[PDB]
């Protein structure tokens, strides 16, 4: 199912060339879940994202 979720805080640029951003993401329908996601493109606090499959958390060192 398609899910929607607000960015809370950005953790920082991740990836080999710094092409992704690791970020703290929380849902709006239930403002209790809190996940780590990695995104492509410029992000800031207050952006809201369309998550296709909202189970796993992103992971990069």
């Amino acid at each position: 199912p398609i899910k929607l979720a607000r960015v809370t805080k950005v953790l920082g640029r991740t990836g080999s060339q710094g092409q992704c951003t690791q970020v703290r993401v929380e849902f709006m329908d239930d403002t209790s879940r809190s996940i780590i996601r990695n995104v492509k493109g410029p992000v800031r606090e207050g952006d809201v994202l369309t998550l296709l499959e909202s189970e796993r958390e992103a992971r990069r060192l």
């Binding site: 950005v10 953790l11 920082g12 640029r13 690791q22 992971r59 060192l61």
Partner: peptide, 25 residues
């Protein structure tokens, strides 16, 4: 601390880099 080492090894560093790129009269 072992907790700090594991958390820092599992997270990403961020922040410090200063890039220098780029009327009244």
């Amino acid at each position: 601390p072992l907790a700090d080492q594991i958390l820092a090894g599992n997270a990403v560093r961020a922040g410090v880099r200063e890039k220098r790129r780029g009327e009244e009269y």
